[PDB]
Symmetry: D2
């Protein structure tokens, strides 16, 4: 059947070597600093067993077996919308897209290998013909069958951006041995989200100038592999769910993976050795994460606009003309992200393997627009709230004999329900005035590369030209051709 | 048959009373200050007779008569996209959207009356039953049959914004008599575009607090109607078509219409007397204009991004990383305008008479997003050009035996064709650095109300509430009942 | 003699009734939620006894008494710069302007009273001649003498912004009884910073339409007055100073003060009963908090520009031309705050009592320019750091026998010193990505009214006219 | 005496070879396309003869000669503020800062040479001891004695930015001969303002990477030098001064200068040969024009904010709270430009020659701040006007028997004076909605390099390191060593 939450939490007790800040984690599923976000993954798995959600969360495969939608391939626009409906439902069900790396997101990128596996094999260098397209498809089919969480770690160490000669010194993961059975790898995958909570690490790399072949590695290994150490930032999870209804639900840890002479059988190596292959194929893997981030950006905008409507209605600024036009900014932002999501689905194309991909240019520029504006939109939500965004009663101040009477009168705006301003306050404060929400803004700003990086890669990949179909209108107006 | 350019130029010599700055106009079709823009309408009609454009420019109605697509009703998504393609082709064929009130735009707004003529009659006050749904339909059918340009004049005078007392001292058009033949109107329709080049004036009004019943008028009268005087700003048309390839094509005049005891028969009056009717119904008339705005916004953004690509290629800054990401901004802006347009088409609804209308929130917030960003985008196009946007050879300077070799070397960038930099500069200069191009920015900024107006009206119209479907997600996250 | 830190910590244990979140505080000086910030006030008082800082931190008065510069009155430009240099050195000494309401700032507004004390009396209504302009000056000179911290609480409750009538039902502090000994006040001062840490509450009011006379209260009372309750948000202080070098130094708490039938003698009442007097004179009180806010804006801008320089150097991006222009924005922002501070001092004027005041237009518009750009400037600093703002070693990770070699190598940029990037990361994280740093952003944004508030109040007070010497040039160019 | 306006008009008819668009110019003083801007320079010269302005416009030198304040050297802050009050007065009397390259601006850069001439000589390469510091000083004394306008042409051809190696094929002015009498130069000074209206061309370069040594020429030659052609864009002057009260006052033409084997004597050669000299010293030359640009930015911000007050008052939006905070934006900008100007004066330093210079970081970052915000400030003024910015009566429409009554009622806002709204519109239209207005914006945006250039150059020249003053506080807070 489809994996359950209990099966997930049980499988975390597997020997994995995990730091979270200054601490060592006995069992990710039960430790104070990690159990809350482990239960969030459990909840994710449990949503696929909820009968009111079976139509949206699951599908019948051609074999007759019911599967999680996170394994659903899409070959047309209607199939894309069904996938987007699944991703959207998962992030709405889970604290308003507050947990952006649920397994559905992690595993989405695997579909690029399924679509066209051969080039990974044929462009390899130094595998002595042991890498097999069939084994790539086999690993992914294995992930599907067991509902395994493959956490992607691709990005380089942030060592020294001064040098193009930097990558000779790199502590980045390299191949130190190749034999009949597989490769041995040594060094760091410098950054990943949620790896302490995953089953398998999806290893990969982006091209950088001068990248040696022994650091071009796409492969998979279990989180509990001997030689693997997960090294995570301190947990930001909060002990009081009444004061912090979002931040008490757990912290989606980020951190690095140390590999000490780790063995990886050829059956789980997708490609090694070719810098050129690392140019466009890695971008094709992360495309699916870029499209997904549009779904998130839309739910996030919708939340921020919503919270603006609620708080201005409750303090009674909502009918002040100058505030109406500020709330219109946050609402316009949401409609903009909605427009880009729907436009990307309309203007899509079929890949080599005949999968339907949404419009690259629309979702990538949609992400750039989100990152350009997001912090201004949070400034606006906080600014519209005035003091109610931070200076509200603790629940015990509120319910105290002496203080209750004063609290209730100070929060007596036009839509009654005085305690409700404390509820809106709590969510605004968790989402954007705590360590826990600040991490989410950093994740959002960096996970798919930041604003200048999005723009640079999109232009390098598009190869826009004066003589290209881009310029036809300009050329005609100037009388060139 | 479909009206020809020749027929239209003939029809302009009808004794209409026109000021264009300090001059009176004997014949708008031949006067130096108007003939170039009169020929631009002539070109508009003539497009409908190009054999290679007949599928795009025309359709076959239920009688078997061929008609210009400006009279085409859209009853579903596919018919809308077919209407948008027509509009897109019209503005691409006419100086890349430099003439935004061609007759297709002007007459689009009449489809609201056709869709649901009855409320215009039934809600009329003081007409003594004289106004009939049938005659509203009969006028619009008469406009169709003769391909008439009905220029909309709705907006008030801009006299005193400080108080609502403003509508009693207003020279705004008022009914001074009602008899059994029709109405006599006296006063001003303060602002119109292209009236001097129209066949009929489409009179309307928007609600404002305390608007008297006698100023609520929706009617139609010929431009040459006795007592109608058309008073236009000075003409910005340029004399040298080589130096000003766009500004020499003609100036789409704006200005005001004086009515002195003008008689309109009941046959040509659509509604009078009801301020409440003027709240929602006029907005419904201009929805079609706001949608069309989105189409122009896309084509304008595509021309701006194309000029950025062209000029940065020509001066050889296109591969400079820091410039590449500035050009990403302008391309990003175009993709945002493409997303809103397609998304509005995708997320539309059926009106009372079963016409398909695009999503009001998406097209209205698309216009907001364009007005908020437009000046920044012009500034980046001009800033990326350097001196080449303004300081370039006149054609006699370029071709002088002595100066030619110096200009050739000065404009010999990485893609050669040195004179092509003058071709691009001329277009940038005309669009963004002449009185002629400034007028178009000002039109674009005000015609559909400015940014703070779009935001206000859109919010007032949408009755957004925290209880409504909008605040659903935020309420769930906040734990509000 | 100038008060010591020890003396100040001792005096906090005076029975003051304080909530911090869900907890009651028996002693503000020693409770884990409050002791660190309390010690920051104790540090403040001790900076005045340092013989190496004496020439900046203290002055000799007419009597020959060494007094703290927080009590120094400036009558010319030179003297205003000496006061400012004091405020600057205080904010550099205390974790880069991270504690914006040290006593020097709190007590600065009292100089408006010292300058023109009469009106406060002469415009009072229903006091029966009990309020003396003599007794306001006596209080402030008593505070001076005993280096007393007087915390300003003027702002209204945020109840209902739809209704203008909603100043009658409001729990705003009102005068319920006026007798011969003094007044009795009941209700709420809805918002204050650091009141739990202060000696006295400075009770004021700003004017809103239809403010009733019984709600127009300018007064002072001790923080431990019977019937006073201090109610503060939960404390955001961090446990581990290694991981959180700024957030572990303590949380400058914000809260409300509840007054339950609180008696205030006439000697400690400044003004009552006149909505008219509450238009101009309360703004003139907070003008000094406003000027000071520009000194902080400059130092905060300087701090942010210096972290941008430190972090872009350490990761090796500082020479990438496109990063260079982004660091340029943060450096220019600093220079913009510097320019406004120095311009405001140059174009100052004398008040009625002969005090030198910096230009109101410049320091107030300087504040608007800060609020407008600040969140975009934080965005640039964080964006410029990349992962290094947040994803970095904990200290036990750094030091581990297995991880040290990896961390040393991953952090080895052009200016070597690999652990230095963790130090920069810890400060960017604390300043801008914690509970603690966010409150400083919220405080900056609201304490002096938000941007749309600064703009409208500045316009309404300036009363800018087409016919006044603003559009002088515009009239001339127009032929009007 | 100080040179008069009329004397200036006579000096223009000196055989200079001048294109303005497709037309050759016989006399810049009198030609329809140039005569108005020629009269604005004549007005400049006549301001120094107005007895009501004698104190502001002129000084007495060490020999008792009364001289135009454009030649006044400032050795402290009081002197700098006297020079700034002079520049401010000139731009206020001349169409509210609408003519940014009056002779006072052009001639201001020459003070860098006067301050410290030796390095122009000592750093010269391949001159064989012919370039003399005393002669740079003698040229500037001669300029001062004849009140001559030296127009500065420094910037390169905008040919190909793709590779520095492309400067191989660049038609930028090069030395094509050095002999005992002087040099011969051939090619283009690609860009300059008001050269058609100047007496002498001030020639220079800025370092770009790969600039060829043979293009490193700092010199001066007359505008009518044989082998010089001035080639200007088309004139944007307007016919009807009632309808265009600013753009009818004339067009400060921009363009390029062609040198065909032009002879410059060693006496008028300041420096040749050394790209390394061209890194710092040319920026010191243009510093004075970056300071001046801040004075213009304050007067221009003052004008915009004023126009915003005047128009919102007239249509009656000025008490609408939402409009009130938008006008605060325009006023805050003016305040910001003021703040930068006054801070830069307060925080100035003495140069090697003893001249007082205002603070470089503050005037240049104030310039950056203006280029970043200017486009948005003009949008705000135009957006605040509504239609009053463009759609208003022409004067004959206003005065018509039939339309007057409608126009008077349509313009009858809370401050009466109906025709004043047309007057405000005319100014708003001319500044921001004509070709003449667009050229000023384009001038302000590029003349002192654009935003990304200002920022890039200020960072390269100040070299702000983590171990310098700018990292002192952050190091302390982070506990990093110094
Ligand atoms: C919270 C979180 C979570 C994750 C990740 C990051 C973070 C912060 N990442 C890695 C993420 O993609 C990465 O941080 C970004 O790509 C940015 O890279 P750097 O941190 O190295 O900044 P980097 O040093 O590249 O950037 C520094 C700053 O300088 C600018 N800059 C740098 N080089 C420039 C240039 N040449 N021109 C112009 N500007 C330049 C950048 O734009 C940026 O503003 C990741 N990765 C992964 O594979 N799987 C994962 O799950 C995650 N998860
Ligand atoms: C951290 C902290 C610390 C302090 C304080 C606040 C905070 C948050 N304050 C109080 C502070 O001055 C107050 O929060 C601000 O004046 C903003 O007021 P409100 O919070 O009531 O917002 P309010 O409800 O007034 O405003 C909320 C939002 O709506 C907008 N808005 C409201 N009315 C509007 C209108 N009519 N037109 C247009 N826009 C409008 C505002 O611009 C803002 O964006 C304070 N006070 C004090 O006296 N001493 C102190 O020490 C402190 N300390
Ligand atoms: O480093 N990179 O090139 C990246 C990293 C992440 C991403 O989503 C795209 C590209």
């Amino acid at each position: 059947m489809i994996r359950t939450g209990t099966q997930y939490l049980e499988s975390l007790n597997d020997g994995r070597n995990v730091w979270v800040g200054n601490e060592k984690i006995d069992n990710v599923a039960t430790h104070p600093k990690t159990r809350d976000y482990a239960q969030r993954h459990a909840d994710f798995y449990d949503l696929h067993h909820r009968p009111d959600l079976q139509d949206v969360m699951t599908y019948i495969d051609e074999g007759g077996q019911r599967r999680a939608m996170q394994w659903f391939g899409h070959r047309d626009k209607e199939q894309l919308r069904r996938k987007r409906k699944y991703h959207e439902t998962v992030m709405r069900e889970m604290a308003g897209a507050s947990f952006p790396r649920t397994p559905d997101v992690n595993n989405y990128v695997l579909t690029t290998y399924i679509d066209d596996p051969a080039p990974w094999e044929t462009q390899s260098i130094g595998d002595d013909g042991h890498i097999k397209a069939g084994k790539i498809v086999d690993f992914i089919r294995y992930a599907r069958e067991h509902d395994l969480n493959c956490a992607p770690q691709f990005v380089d160490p942030q060592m020294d951006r001064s040098n193009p000669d930097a990558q000779e010194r790199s502590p980045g993961l390299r191949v130190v041995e190749k034999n009949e059975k597989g490769i041995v790898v040594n060094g760091v995958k410098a950054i990943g989200t949620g790896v302490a909570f995953a089953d398998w690490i999806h290893i990969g790399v982006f091209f950088r100038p001068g990248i040696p072949g022994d650091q071009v590695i796409f492969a998979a290994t279990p989180v509990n592999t001997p030689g693997v150490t997960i090294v995570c930032r301190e947990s930001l999870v909060k002990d009081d769910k009444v004061e912090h209804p979002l931040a008490a639900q757990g912290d989606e840890l980020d951190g690095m993976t140390v590999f000490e002479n780790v063995f990886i059988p050829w059956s789980h190596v997708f490609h090694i050795g070719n810098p050129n292959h690392a140019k466009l194929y890695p971008q094709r893997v992360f495309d699916w994460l870029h499209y997904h981030a549009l779904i998130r950006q839309m739910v996030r905008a919708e939340l921020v606009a919503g919270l603006a409507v609620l708080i201005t209605e409750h303090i009674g600024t909502n009918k002040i003309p100058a505030v109406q036009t500020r709330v219109a900014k946050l609402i316009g932002f949401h409609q903009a992200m909605l427009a880009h999501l729907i436009a990307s689905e309309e203007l899509g194309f079929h890949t080599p393997g005949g999968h339907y991909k949404p419009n690259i240019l629309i979702y990538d520029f949609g992400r750039a627009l989100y990152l350009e504006n997001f912090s201004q939109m949070i400034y606006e939500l906080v600014d519209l709230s005035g003091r109610s965004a931070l200076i509200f009663a603790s629940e015990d101040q509120w319910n105290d004999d002496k203080l209750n009477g004063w609290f209730e009168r100070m929060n007596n705006g036009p839509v009654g329900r005085p305690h409700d301003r404390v509820k809106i306050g709590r969510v605004i404060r968790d989402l954007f005035l705590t360590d826990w929400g600040s991490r989410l803004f950093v994740f959002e700003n960096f996970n798919g590369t930041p604003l200048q990086g999005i723009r640079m890669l999109t232009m390098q990949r598009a190869e826009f030209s004066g003589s290209g179909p881009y310029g036809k209108l300009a050329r005609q107006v100037c009388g060139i051709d």
